[PDB]
């Protein structure tokens, strides 16, 4: 390989012999593309001109009163589909066009990275069919239907838990068989090299606005950046830029669930174990005799059961810290933001606006200037939160 | 590793190739396995490849996946198939037994504690269905050192370079596959002195077997054709004996020619 | 009056006489603020780092293939509440601090600009109450909820036809009463003078960023922009800063409904009569004895019965063209530009879309420069287009 | 506008207030409604004020919108009440007779063809509900020129200027409101030579009607306290008559004092 497949010992490319070739041509392209200036200027058009690049930096108003935190949120919920997932899908699908692939394989467990899929596809046009557990689909039809509409195949996953793992792994069978003419648009940074790699810099513009816009607006960078971890691009688009800036704090929240203590949850990197799974050597939920579990949380889209290689090393050195949310925590972040600032999260990104709450109710004469990443816009969870209450 | 040495030489020495059933440890249940293998045995198997159930099957196809499926629901266990895997050796001292496994279930408890087991209970060969020859080193080396053979999957779109390592690291056999000139693969790795080649591609009928003989390989692993009858007949168990027994005589006799 | 209630022969302040003392107020702070470079500055704030401002132009790619028709896409879909409505809510809601209210009054049809006007108030701190036809509460469910999420009070109005109708003339008598300490948040550039001078110019931005938007892309202006006409505030505020540009043509597109000679429609500019209500003279939707009717359109937010008095005035003078378009139409254009370009329109802005789609069709020869306003985004359609498919 | 000046030369004479009663033309039915107005007369009432059904009356309250319901869902039309209106004229030749109405059913067919109707139907004033004093000119210009006297509210919320318009545009009567120091209002209005003030605020007892007269007002309007009867007797017709009746007598008698 051109590049290192490893993040300390978390990585590699753990996958039947037959896809090695795939992975490959994909790192080199990677390589290449990010050598060419020609593709840049595409890939910038397409997110300032059709995504809405770059995302503004809101000053919350409101939530910090009586404190001496300063919040800034980082608008993804701004950006065209409603979520950071958007970024990365464009220049995957470019890259995909660059190998002179026709066809896009996606892998989609709430459902907004396969509708990224689907209106990148639809827009640079590639034949597109996603893989969601079929208990997914299910009860993201307002996304399948969303999918359908803008003309993508969605193929219904009844194997194993008939959830995102499963997803997972139907579409690498697929990829096994078609990769001459399909491209393999995963998720989030995880699976095998290089995409932990490719998915963190077509999301690193993210971190590089956010520190741009800081720099304007405080004349300073911030004490700590904020982000929910599923799989960790969000997180990783928010941190790359940060990871050389030693005096400021990269913080991930995982999904916390009923409570770490029930068993019921989905925060692997901080309670799971080390385990070869998706391609990769990373932490991940499993019984104690190897079998993969689930990852449990009210937010649909922090459903990966295992988390990314260079998360999972940022830890282990103590460059960034891991933190869990419960449910409850985050449905209170989530009604506070609507009643305080008038923007509706979505209950991802309320994982990670629960902790920022927390470090300034906690230590209210604390000075400090925090940055959260607003992955999404919440009018998907309108229902849930509903019913919630 | 021994095991394999040994039958190849026999094999030879008759001029005939080798019929390698590949069956799910625990399907339908523990005792209706056993029963089955000793049948496959009997019927004239040559060797034999066993799976352990794993929950994310990623190199797996529906009919492997549903028999995982039956063995879970069936209570089967990880530890439950070192049990029988000790039982089949004790009633059958010399046929090689080869493991197909993920490699999660091979780490969890160490590398090399899992090869330890293995060679404890009498395996003779393991695949690791999503380790890479890339990858392969400390799977490679644990194997090495409690006398299990690492075995190799050479793919359709193999290279030379791939040809070569393949060669090198694997023992017992090499795995060749057709993804949905073989006679120039089977001869490269002949040339580079690879373990015997088993056609594992798609072998149901024992017209495949018999072409895999005459292409150069040293036999074929049938791959879904046997998880195929225990479905077919999972309602009739003393028919689901009999339709296997009646296959593996079929496919073994055409190894022969 | 410090500015002309009329724009030729419609508008005026026809209202009770108890209403004028909050009209003259209204007028005076409108213009003092537009005259307040610390209001402009503070407008623009809000606009660019908390609403998204300014929004993308987006050049269609694959909708034109086979034409000589080059299509651009104004992306207020793009804005912070998913519509071009937040833009004057904002402006609105300042004027009414500079006012020294803490209250405010809105009416809602669709819930678009009953959405917008809570987040404003959650924001800037108002207490809102939003009157909303029964009718339309009860088949604008999601909104509801959004509306309470962000902490307004919704009132169904049962009286009439509990429709958009009666939630108007509810905002107007409770702003009778309490003029003092509230502020009615009218929803578009119609009612009497000062709102349709007041919403038109905290929409302008549309057209103002149009113009220099395109002249940066192709280098010269287009041959027409083209937008959904409702009560006409999308359409004012994108037309505004070409009118003096004689050589752009300006055309609003209101809704054919089932067909105009089927009579279920609500295009009352073009085949209404001039009459008296809500406060002005323009063209509404009336029976032969004066009574005035309901709107019918597929599209939930161009049910307003009447129209603003510029566009009455625009048309007269023949500045500015208007054209209607069936249900039909409007679905056919959500459609292809949700499979061709990966855009979910709202069906409101699928109106102006069919028109430009049905521009190029019919003369496939001819060379054109159009400009769409999109006016939202039609996540809140999916349902419908659904249940219509 | 003649029959004003001369109830108001009468009422003066007899240093007496008057009493006028406010009702929906066709509210709950033609026949049930020409009934009311006879009973409103025969009680005691010195002018009536008439509303003419309007979708959207957007300067009325719950009674009244509810009033118009009823009408509209009896088929009352605006055609349908200027015949009502030229047969209550018929029976009742003296008594002043007033119209509110919206600026649209006043403007459908034209504002002069609508002050002529009322001409020719025999209404003498007419109040347009929402056309304030700054836009009235074409509206008071047609009913000067057909002999109808313009009536116009006076607020609450009234400043100097404006009691000088309406002073000076309004004939028959002033309107004078209360929303939810008047003797200076009434007093100005005198003073810039208005026309008579009736307090329209909000009476409903006999109590009020005497404090109007007191105040400095000419009278007293009760301008739903009658729509609330119809609502409450609904039920029973003849003991909807019965109470009106009685209410307006009652209401009758302290204007006298
Ligand atoms: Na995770
Ligand atoms: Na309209």
Redesign the interface.
């Known amino acids: 390989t051109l590049l290192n497949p490893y993040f300390g010992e978390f990585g ?10 795939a992975l490959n041509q994909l790192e080199e392209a990677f390589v290449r593309a990010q050598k060419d200036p020609e593709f840049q200027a595409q890939f910038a058009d397409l997110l ?3 995504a ?1 690049r770059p ?5 919350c ?2 939530i910090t009163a009586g404190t001496r935190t300063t919040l800034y949120l980082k ?1 993804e919920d ?1 950006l ?1 589909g ?1 979520a950071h997932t958007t970024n990365q899908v464009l220049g995957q699908a470019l890259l995909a066009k660059r190998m002179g692939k026709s066809e896009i394989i996606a892998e989609t467990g709430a459902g907004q990275h396969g509708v990224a899929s ?6 640079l ?1 590639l034949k597109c069919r996603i893989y969601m557990g079929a208990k997914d689909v299910e009860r993201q039809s ?1 996304n399948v ?2 999918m359908r ?3 993508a195949e969605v193929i219904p996953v009844h ?2 838990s008939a959830t995102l ?2 997803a ?2 139907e579409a ?2 697929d990829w ?2 078609s990769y001459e003419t399909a491209h393999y648009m995963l998720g989030t940074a995880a699976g095998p090299h290089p995409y932990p790699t490719i998915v963190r810099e077509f999301q690193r513009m993210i971190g590089e606005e956010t520190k741009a816009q800081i720099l304007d607006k405080e004349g300073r960078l911030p004490d700590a950046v904020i982000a929910c971890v599923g799989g960790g691009s969000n997180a990783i688009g928010m941190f790359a830029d940060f990871i050389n800036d030693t005096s400021v704090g990269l913080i991930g929240v995982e999904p916390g669930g009923h409570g770490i203590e029930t068993g019921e949850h989905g925060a692997p990197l901080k309670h799971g174990r080390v ?5 990769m050597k990373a932490p991940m939920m ?1 019984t104690a ?5 689930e990852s449990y949380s009210i937010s649909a889209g922090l459903d990966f059961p295992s988390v990314g290689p260079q998360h999972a090393y940022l830890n282990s050195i103590g460059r960034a810290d891991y933190v869990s949310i419960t449910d409850d925590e985050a449905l209170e972040a989530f ?1 506070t933001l ?7 999260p979505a209950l991802e990104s309320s994982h990670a606006l629960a902790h920022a709450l927390k470090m300034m109710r906690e230590q209210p004469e604390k000075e400090q200037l925090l940055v959260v990443n607003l992955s999404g816009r919440g ?1 998907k969870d ?1 229902f849930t ?2 019913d919630i209450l | 590793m021994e095991r394999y040495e040994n039958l190849f030489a026999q094999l030879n020495d008759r001029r005939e190739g080798a019929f390698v059933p590949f069956v799910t440890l625990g399907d339908p249940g523990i005792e209706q396995s056993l029963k089955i293998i000793d049948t496959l045995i009997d019927a004239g198997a040559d060797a034999l490849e066993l799976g352990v159930p794993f929950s994310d099957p990623l190199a797996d196809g529906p009919t492997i996946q549903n028999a995982n499926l039956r063995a879970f629901a069936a209570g089967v266990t990880p530890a439950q198939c070192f049990e029988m895997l000790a039982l089949i050796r004790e009633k059958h001292p010399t046929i090689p037994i080869g493991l197909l496994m993920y490699a999660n279930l091979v780490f969890n408890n160490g590398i090399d504690a899992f090869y330890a087991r293995c060679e404890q209970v009498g395996v003779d060969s393991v695949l690791v269905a999503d380790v890479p020859v890339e990858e392969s080193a400390p799977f490679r080396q644990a194997a090495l050192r409690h006398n299990i053979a690492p075995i190799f999957i050479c793919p359709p779109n193999a290279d030379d370079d791939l040809l070569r390592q393949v060669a090198s690291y694997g023992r017992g056999y090499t795995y060749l596959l057709s993804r949905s000139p073989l006679h120039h693969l089977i001869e490269k790795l002949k040339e580079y002195h690879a373990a015997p080649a088993l056609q594992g591609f798609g072998i149901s009928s024992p017209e495949q077997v018999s072409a895999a003989v005459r292409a150069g390989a040293a036999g074929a692993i049938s791959g879904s054709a046997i998880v195929k009858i225990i479905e077919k007949n999972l309602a009739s168990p003393k028919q689901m004996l009999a339709e296997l027994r009646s296959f593996v005589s079929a496919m073994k006799a055409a190894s022969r020619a």
Chains 1, 3 share one sequence.
Request: proline residues 4%.
């Open positions: 590699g490319m753990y996958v039947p012999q037959i896809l090695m070739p300032k001109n059709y809405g995302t503004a930096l809101t000053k108003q409101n608008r701004l065209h409603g689907a209106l990148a596809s639809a827009l046009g307002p239907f969303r509409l803008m003309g194997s194993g793992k499963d997972c792994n690498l069978r096994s068989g385990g070869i799974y998706f391609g499993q005799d190897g079998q993969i579990e009604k609507c009643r305080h600032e008038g923007i509706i009018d309108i939160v509903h």
